[PDB]
């Protein structure tokens, strides 16, 4: 388990973790509680692995989009700030941190991508994506390049795939439809195809990743990059005269970055939920707290009403906010994990030449919507109705208690047959469940209660996956 009487904090290395640790050095001066701040790689995947087990950080930092996924698994403790503290932060930031009406984390800051550009190489950054091929030709002639940004992370190409109609899950009346993904429509194809053409024509390289982009830009080798607020600090240092402006349009449409609220949730299994509550309420979410972080890597548009007033006056922050308006706040639902992995795959495949745009986007389509599951599920429904059919057919007009548990399909795809009150019923384990194959010669168990109803818990304890 976590150690009682210290705070361990996980935040992304691209963020202002040294500012954060100075705020932690404030808490410690005061309370005598050591605060360690770390930045493991693949933080957002390492957290549910280790959290699942009663281990890992007290507090976790990330864009809100994966918090839905964490709360659904029950790994985040419910935060309970009082009214006076909720008025200190913007209503729309609490929204992003709400899952089933429950607040699952603290908002810190809004981040959205912008076009960042070298004012000496490009006093007039292009208004449109289509301008970019020609602009690269000119810059190649001067031993430079038009644009480099991270091609390995679908977050960065998203605004272009979204530009002209691509979308994650369709919003409709309060609710995201996870059955209606927007990854294989004409718009997405258009965006991606355009991006892939840049690569085919050598206006960009498919290898290019976060550190190659940052470095190239800060050395004045490329005219433009697409990054967020955290990136501004290293540019300050590089002394490259940079602007931050609106993202180029595509087919006359604004690019639509997915917008993240950076957020702090508390690990459910930590014996330090009160220390973490006092840390994040009285030390971090203060001007004094945020300022120390922002002066390390700019947060973007902060969630705290009183410090955002100052930061609002920065042209850079204005531009962050403008792009933010033209994009969309990320859904925080659990399926976000599957959507991002699907699009990451599609983009890289299309980029390397492994798969055309159609093929790649079709597969992401198929993966993102979890179509395999929907199809397996309907098969299992059918089969379970059929088993109900045969049973009733016999129990009636077949040759000669009123009190059964009725045929049911649980949330894992095991069909529990009509059984007698008092029965303990075994059914083989699922052959498949969420991407994983199980050894089917082991059993699940469910009890048909004496009163005619299925017990609500089902014993899946014996379903061992089979791997290697």
């Amino acid at each position: 388990k976590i150690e009682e009487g210290k705070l361990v904090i996980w935040i992304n290395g691209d963020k202002g973790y040294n500012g954060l640790a100075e705020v932690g050095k404030k808490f410690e001066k005061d309370t005598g509680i050591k605060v360690t701040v770390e930045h493991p790689d693949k933080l957002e995947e390492k957290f549910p692995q280790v959290a699942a087990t009663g281990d890992g950080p007290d507090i976790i930092f990330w864009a809100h989009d994966r918090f839905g996924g964490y709360a659904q698994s029950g790994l985040l403790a419910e935060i309970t700030p009082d009214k006076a503290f909720q008025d200190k932060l913007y209503p729309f930031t609490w929204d992003a941190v709400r899952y089933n009406g429950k607040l699952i984390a603290y908002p810190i800051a809004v981040e959205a991508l912008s076009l960042i550009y070298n004012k000496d190489l490009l006093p007039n950054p292009p208004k449109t994506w289509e301008e970019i091929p020609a602009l690269d030709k000119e810059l190649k002639a001067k031993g430079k390049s038009a644009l480099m940004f991270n091609l390995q992370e679908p977050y960065f190409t998203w605004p272009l795939i979204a530009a002209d109609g691509g979308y994650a899950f369709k919003y409709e009346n309060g609710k995201y439809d996870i059955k209606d993904v927007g990854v294989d429509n004409a718009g997405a194809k258009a965006g991606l195809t355009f991006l892939v053409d840049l690569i085919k024509n050598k206006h960009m390289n498919a290898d290019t990743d976060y550190s190659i982009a940052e470095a190239a830009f800060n050395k004045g080798e490329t005219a433009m990059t697409i990054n967020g607020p955290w990136a501004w600090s290293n540019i300050d240092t590089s002394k490259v005269n940079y602007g931050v402006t609106v993202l180029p349009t595509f087919k006359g449409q604004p690019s639509k970055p997915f917008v993240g609220v950076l957020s702090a949730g508390i690990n459910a299994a930590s014996p330090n939920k009160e220390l973490a509550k006092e840390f994040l309420e009285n030390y971090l979410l203060t001007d004094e707290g945020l300022e120390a972080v922002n002066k390390d890597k700019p947060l973007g548009a902060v969630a705290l009403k009183s410090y955002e007033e100052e930061l609002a006056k920065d042209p850079r922050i204005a531009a962050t906010m403008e792009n933010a308006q033209k994009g969309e706040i990320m859904p925080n639902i659990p399926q976000m994990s599957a959507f991002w992995y699907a699009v990451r795959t599609a983009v890289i495949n299309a980029a390397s030449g492994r798969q055309t745009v159609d093929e790649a986007l079709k597969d992401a389509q198929t993966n993102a919507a979890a179509e395999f599951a929907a199809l397996l599920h309907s098969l299992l429904e059918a089969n379970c109705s059929l088993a109900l059919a045969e049973e009733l057919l016999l129990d009636g007009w077949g040759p000669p208690p009123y009190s059964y548990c009725n045929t049911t399909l649980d949330q894992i795809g095991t069909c529990w047959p009509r059984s007698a009150a008092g029965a303990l019923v075994e059914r083989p384990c699922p052959e498949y469940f969420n991407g994983v194959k199980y050894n089917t010669t082991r059993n699940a168990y469910r009890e048909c209660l004496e009163n005619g109803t299925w017990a609500s818990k089902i014993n899946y304890s014996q379903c061992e996956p089979i791997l290697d």
Partner: peptide
Amino acid sequence: SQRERAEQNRIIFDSV
């Protein structure tokens, strides 16, 4: 990937 996907399914199984 699969060693870890299965690790989430265990949680779901544990709950359900």
